[PDB]
Amino acid sequence: AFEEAEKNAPAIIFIDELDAIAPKREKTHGEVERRIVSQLLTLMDGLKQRAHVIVMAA
Amino acid sequence: LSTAILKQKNRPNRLIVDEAINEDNSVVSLSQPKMDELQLFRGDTVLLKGKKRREAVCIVLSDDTCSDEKIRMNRVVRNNLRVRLGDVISIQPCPDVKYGKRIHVLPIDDTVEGITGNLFEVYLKPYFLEAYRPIRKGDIFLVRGGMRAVEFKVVETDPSPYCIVAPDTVIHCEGEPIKREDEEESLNEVGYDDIGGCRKQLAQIKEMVELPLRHPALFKEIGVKPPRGILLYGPPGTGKTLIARAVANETGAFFFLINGPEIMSKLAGESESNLRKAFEEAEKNAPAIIFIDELDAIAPKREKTHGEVERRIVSQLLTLMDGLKQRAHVIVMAATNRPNSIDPALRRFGRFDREVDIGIPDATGRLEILQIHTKNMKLADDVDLEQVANETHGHVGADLAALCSEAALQAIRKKMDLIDLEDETIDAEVMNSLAVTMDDFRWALSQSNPSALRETVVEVPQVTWEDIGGLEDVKRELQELVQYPVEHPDKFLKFGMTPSKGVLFYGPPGCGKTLLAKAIANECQANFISIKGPELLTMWFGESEANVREIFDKARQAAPCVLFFDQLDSIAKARGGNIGDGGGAADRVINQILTEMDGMSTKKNVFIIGATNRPDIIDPAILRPGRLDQLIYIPLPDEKSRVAILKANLRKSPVAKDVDLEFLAKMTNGFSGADLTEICQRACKLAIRESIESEIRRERERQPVPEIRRDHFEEAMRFARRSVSDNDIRKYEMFAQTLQQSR
Numbered sequence: 078a079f080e081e082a083e084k085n086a087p088a089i090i091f092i093d094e095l096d097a098i099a100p101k102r103e104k105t106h107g108e109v110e111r112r113i114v115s116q117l118l119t120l121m122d123g124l125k126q127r128a129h130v131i132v133m134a135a
Numbered sequence: 136l137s138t139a140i141l142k143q144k145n146r147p148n149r150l151i152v153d154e155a156i157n158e159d160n161s162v163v164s165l166s167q168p169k170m171d172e173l174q175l176f177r178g179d180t181v182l183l184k185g186k187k188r189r190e191a192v193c194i195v196l197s198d199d200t201c202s203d204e205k206i207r208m209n210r211v212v213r214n215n216l217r218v219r220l221g222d223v224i225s226i227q228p229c230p231d232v233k234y235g236k237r238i239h240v241l242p243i244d245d246t247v248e249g250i251t252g253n254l255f256e257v258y259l260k261p262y263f264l265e266a267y268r269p270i271r272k273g274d275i276f277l278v279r280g281g282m283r284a285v286e287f288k289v290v291e292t293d294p295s296p297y298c299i300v301a302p303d304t305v306i307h308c309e310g311e312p313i314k315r316e317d318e319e320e321s322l323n324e325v326g327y328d329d330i331g332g333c334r335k336q337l338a339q340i341k342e343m344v345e346l347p348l349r350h351p352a353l354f355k356e357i358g359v360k361p362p363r364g365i366l367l368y369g370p371p372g373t374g375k376t377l378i379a380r381a382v383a384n385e386t387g388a389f390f391f392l393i394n395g396p397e398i399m400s401k402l403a404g405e406s407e408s409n410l411r412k413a414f415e416e417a418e419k420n421a422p423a424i425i426f427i428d429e430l431d432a433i434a435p436k437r438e439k440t441h442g443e444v445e446r447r448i449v450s451q452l453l454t455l456m457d458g459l460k461q462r463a464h465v466i467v468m469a470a471t472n473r474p475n476s477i478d479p480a481l482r483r484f485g486r487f488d489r490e491v492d493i494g495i496p497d498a499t500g501r502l503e504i505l506q507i508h509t510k511n512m513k514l515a516d517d518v519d520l521e522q523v524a525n526e527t528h529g530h531v532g533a534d535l536a537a538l539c540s541e542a543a544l545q546a547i548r549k550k551m552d553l554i555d556l557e558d559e560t561i562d563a564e565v566m567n568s569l570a571v572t573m574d575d576f577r578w579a580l581s582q583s584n585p586s587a588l589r590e591t592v593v594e595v596p597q598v599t600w601e602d603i604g605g606l607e608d609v610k611r612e613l614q615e616l617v618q619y620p621v622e623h624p625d626k627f628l629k630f631g632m633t634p635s636k637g638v639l640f641y642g643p644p645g646c647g648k649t650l651l652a653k654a655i656a657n658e659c660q661a662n663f664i665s666i667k668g669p670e671l672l673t674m675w676f677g678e679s680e681a682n683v684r685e686i687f688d689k690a691r692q693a694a695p696c697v698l699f700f701d702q703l704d705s706i707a708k709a710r711g712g713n714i715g716d717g718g719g720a721a722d723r724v725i726n727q728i729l730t731e732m733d734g735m736s737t738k739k740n741v742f743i744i745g746a747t748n749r750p751d752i753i754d755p756a757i758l759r760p761g762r763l764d765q766l767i768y769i770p771l772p773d774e775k776s777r778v779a780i781l782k783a784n785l786r787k788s789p790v791a792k793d794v795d796l797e798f799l800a801k802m803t804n805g806f807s808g809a810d811l812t813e814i815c816q817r818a819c820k821l822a823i824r825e826s827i828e829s830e831i832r833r834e835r836e837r838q839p840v841p842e843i844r845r846d847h848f849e850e851a852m853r854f855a856r857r858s859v860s861d862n863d864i865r866k867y868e869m870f871a872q873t874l875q876q877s878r
């Protein structure tokens with residue numbers, strides 16, 4: 078999702094049901110949820126404002 | 136118009152089932168005027184629809200003896216239609232029925248036994264010789280002749296399913312005979328008419344599941360999207376799975392059943408793949424219905440879940456129910472008795488958006504359920520299902536089935552004298568005499584109890600109102616407070632006053648509070664829940680509140696129910712008095728109790744009775760209006776009440792005539808009911824000691840005491856003591872004065 082997001086300069090990402098893939102790490106009982114949250118964090122940080130990719134969440 | 140879809144409109148095809156005088160299996164008779172109204176000729180083939188999606192084909196005949204509103208059938212085609220006498224069926228002209236190219240039949244296994252010759256040559260061939268009979272696939276027909284008449288099932292038809300058996304048509308009975316049990320199970324199939332007390336719920340279900348699948352064009356044109364997710368929720372045994380079976384049997388749409396825990400599989404990724412396969416197979420065969428029984432098994436809240444596979448399954452269910460909109464005609468219906476345990480996101484818009492509450496039936500609904508369950512039994516004439524419906528205050532439909540089963544089992548027990556279990560066979564006369572009577576149903580009602588109140592049930596002594604002496608005003612007030620709200624709510628609504636739903640008993644120890652509770656349990660026709668004070672408290676945090684919630688919920692489920700709190704001050708003590716000492720769980724318990732007392736609507740008839748001999752330490756909030764409104768002072772008995780108590784205790788005892796109870800009442804001024812009972816018990820023990828010593832003396836001389844006497848009571852009275860002091864009485868007097876001042 079993120080990669081074919083940066084591939085197109087005006088591309089946009091929308092994450093519906095953010096709480097599903099991004100629960101609070103303080104209260105969570107699974108390794109995979111924490112991994113996916115941190116992976117989303119790394120994907121967000123990888124953006125250098127040159128890709129011009131806008132990510133909304135609901 | 137809520138249940139308009141249940142009632143069937145009067146149509147020319149709609150006709151009452153009637154007995155046929157002379158019609159054979161392949162023909163039926165209708166009245167000539169009604170026949171002309173239907174534009175039907177003699178000798179025309181006719182297609183009969185029936186319950187549980189079963190149809191038959193016959194030949195319409197004109198009979199003047201037949202009624203116009205009635206269509207005449209023999210029992211064979213009635214069994215082919217799964218119908219009985221008094222039912223309404225629709226008859227239509229079956230078009231382009233063709234002579235059968237070949238038809239394959241299978242006889243029933245029981246009938247073939249004892250028939251040495253060929254079934255075809257003896258029965259089938261003369262039956263179909265120049266018959267030109269119309270038949271359908273799956274029909275069962277009986278042919279007379281030989282040693283025994285033989286039944287047959289037309290398994291295969293060509294052309295299918297309707298075909299005319301011309302002489303050139305080849306009918307053959309080779310193959311495996313059909314078991315009688317299979318035909319019995321097919322005939323005894325669950326339908327919409329096997330459900331009782333859920334007319335409104337059946338209306339909602341038919342409006343949501345049957346109408347969109349039959350007629351989706353109407354929903355498209357009116358502008359709405361038909362509901363996709365339907366969730367049946369209710370107490371156990373209320374009939375959710377019964378409704379699912381009825382829908383599965385009586386719906387033409389493809390039915391897919393998902394048992395919850397069956398989703399799980401050992402292989403990684405196989406469970407959500409099983410869910411995906413279920414939804415894909417529903418899409419392949421559309422219109423489709425997916426029934427998920429025990430939805431809470433695979434769909435708990437993801438936040439509370441500690442397993443990754445369970446959370447992935449909940450997410451897969453969310454995704455599939457979201458994509459259900461793309462699916463053309465798949466409808467997902469789920470059943471659960473723990474609707475609160477379901478993941479909340481699954482109850483949102485677009486997924487399980489419709490919820491049907493299969494609740495506890497009322498008196499008329501219980502009568503319908505009893506009529507449904509007793510239709511096959513051999514009831515006697517004296518039976519009265521109306522009384523049985525009125526007695527079962529908390530039964531849900533599984534309890535009524537249990538009641539019918541127990542009544543029939545008692546009926547069978549009454550013949551265990553005539554038939555021994557070790558006997559190899561039974562005389563036919565014993566079967567002929569066997570029948571269920573009203574006495575058996577009354578025995579069942581005596582044993583019957585709601586399934587919900589199976590953990591709170593306690594053995595209560597058989598205390599009767601005549602066992603209690605005095606307290607006549609209290610007895611009358613309690614009887615009215617129990618009977619009036621349940622019997623005549625309309626008057627209370629008319630005058631605008633809600634009936635009091637809370638009673639507290641306060642008084643000296645031993646004055647008759649728990650005895651009154653026992654009398655209420657034995658005599659009143661209301662379910663009784665008696666709980667000890669500290670029964671609910673649990674060390675684990677959050678469990679005591681859950682216990683209060685469970686007890687109040689199962690009180691509501693059994694309404695009209697009486698919820699008795701013996702030693703209420705343990706359950707409800709003054710807040711802040713012991714707040715500093717302890718964790719604070721008792722305050723949470725009392726707050727939960729207050730919430731439950733406030734939460735009850737008046738429509739549920741849950742009477743709450745509290746008993747305590749320490750009203751001064753009852754929490755003041757409990758006595759506030761709306762919760763435990765009526766406060767009753769069970770006082771220390773007076774002279775007339777003491778005479779009544781002494782008579783009630785000695786009612787079943789042999790007491791000498793010269794024993795004067797009036798003087799005993801006079802001398803025991805400050806005594807309570809427990810004190811008088813102790814006096815009588817002491818007199819009884821003295822009499823028993825005298826009798827035992829007399830028997831010992833007679834045995835000694837070899838190697839009396841017909842009743843209690845005046846000397847026994849005289850000896851017992853010197854041991855007697857007044858249990859309640861004057862200061863104790865003054866305590867309740869001050870409580871009453873303060874309470875009156877507050878009010």
Ligand SMILES: Nc1ncnc2c1ncn2[C@@H]1O[C@H](COP(=O)(O)OP(=O)(O)OP(=O)(O)O)[C@@H](O)[C@H]1O
Pocket residue numbers: 329330331332333369370371372373374375376377378470471472504507531532533534536
């Ligand atoms: N309204 C009713 N009319 C007729 N029979 C009923 C009705 N409700 C229940 N029954 C009978 O009682 C039993 C109900 O069992 P069922 O599986 O339908 O209940 P349920 O609601 O699914 O319960 P649970 O929550 O424990 O799964 C069946 O034997 C059924 O014949």
Ligand SMILES: Nc1ncnc2c1ncn2[C@@H]1O[C@H](COP(=O)(O)OP(=O)(O)OP(=O)(O)O)[C@@H](O)[C@H]1O
Pocket residue numbers: 602603604605606643644645646647648649650651746747748779780783784807808809810812
């Ligand atoms: N009015 C009465 N008629 C007959 N027996 C009575 C009466 N009042 C009390 N008794 C008898 O005296 C005893 C009193 O017990 P009971 O359960 O009625 O007391 P209680 O009022 O609930 O008191 P406690 O506060 O000690 O629990 C029992 O043995 C009961 O049978």
Ligand SMILES: [Mg+2]
Pocket residue numbers: 375376428470
């Ligand atoms: Mg069930």
Ligand SMILES: [Mg+2]
Pocket residue numbers: 648649701746
């Ligand atoms: Mg008591």
